[PDB]
Amino acid sequence: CPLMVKVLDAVRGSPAINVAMHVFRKAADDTWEPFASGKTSESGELHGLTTEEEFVEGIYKVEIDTKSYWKALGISPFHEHAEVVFTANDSGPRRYTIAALLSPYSYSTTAVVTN
Amino acid sequence: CPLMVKVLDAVRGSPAINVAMHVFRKAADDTWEPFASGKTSESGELHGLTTEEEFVEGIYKVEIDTKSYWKALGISPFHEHAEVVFTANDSGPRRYTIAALLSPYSYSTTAVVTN
Ligand SMILES: CCc1oc2cc(O)ccc2c1C(=O)c1cc(I)c(O)c(I)c1
Numbered sequence: 001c002p003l004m005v006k007v008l009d010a011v012r013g014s015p016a017i018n019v020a021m022h023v024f025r026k027a028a029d030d031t032w033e034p035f036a037s038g039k040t041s042e043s044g045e046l047h048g049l050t051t052e053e054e055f056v057e058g059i060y061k062v063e064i065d066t067k068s069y070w071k072a073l074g075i076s077p078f079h080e081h082a083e084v085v086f087t088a089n090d091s092g093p094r095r096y097t098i099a100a101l102l103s104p105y106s107y108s109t110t111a112v113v114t115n
Numbered sequence: 116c117p118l119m120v121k122v123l124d125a126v127r128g129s130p131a132i133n134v135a136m137h138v139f140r141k142a143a144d145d146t147w148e149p150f151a152s153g154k155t156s157e158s159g160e161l162h163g164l165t166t167e168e169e170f171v172e173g174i175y176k177v178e179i180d181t182k183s184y185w186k187a188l189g190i191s192p193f194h195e196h197a198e199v200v201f202t203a204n205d206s207g208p209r210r211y212t213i214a215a216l217l218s219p220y221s222y223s224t225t226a227v228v229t230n
């Protein structure tokens with residue numbers, strides 16, 4: 001699993017379940033082409049987005065549909081989405097977890113990059 | 116001052132000085148148009164980006180150049196930039212402070228919205 005996304009909810013103290021997201025890879029003309037997408041599981045995790053062979057060096061964007069999540073909970077949110085943009089680099093074997101902790105007017109995102 | 120951006124450095128415990136950012140506004144054809152830009156001062160704040168009359172309803176994106184900030188301190192960070200996308204002024208004019216707290220592999224962003 002070269003790339004996994006985990007989303008938590010800071011209002012309810014729980015995984016953020018059924019959060020949709022799309023992953024994009026930056027093309028040579030600086031546009032964003034779709035790469036993978038899915039919705040978080042009951043654990044707040046989205047697995048299986050890509051494979052080692054496909055996940056080459058480049059700039060990637062994860063767009064997490066936080067607005068729909070808060071709307072489904074009846075809570076007014078600030079952001080249209082949470083966007084995480086990063087370069088994937090080959091420095092030995094690397095697995096990436098992109099994590100996001102969500103509140104209606106704030107989010108915190110980190111990366112856990114391991115071998 | 117309807118739109119202000121404040122950036123802090125979580126490694127040094129200080130304002131993040133000389134951080135460049137660009138603000139965009141979504142046009143009716145759904146492209147991002149340039150709206151304003153600037154860099155943070157010694158206080159970590161960027162004031163004066165827009166005016167009440169120009170800052171109409173719309174979807175705005177603030178792209179904060181966090182990568183250049185960390186690279187100048189010798190650090191190779193995870194993110195290319197921090198992106199903040201939000202609908203503004205949908206219920207009348209408000210004042211927005213966008214805040215970002217930066218670490219090399221993580222950032223937290225919030226908004227303070229006042230009437
Ligand atoms: C210390 C855990 C943690 O704290 C945070 C605080 C934040 O503001 C934002 C994100 C996190 C975050 C995670 O990224 C996280 C949580 C779990 I549970 C995991 O299994 C994994 I992998 C990663």
Ligand SMILES: CCc1oc2cc(O)ccc2c1C(=O)c1cc(I)c(O)c(I)c1
Pocket residue numbers: 121122123212214215216223224225227
């Ligand atoms: C970048 C600003 C900021 O972002 C954060 C994110 C967090 O998760 C926790 C705290 C902060 C935080 C601040 O400490 C802060 C905010 C304002 I508005 C200030 O006027 C002053 I002085 C300090």
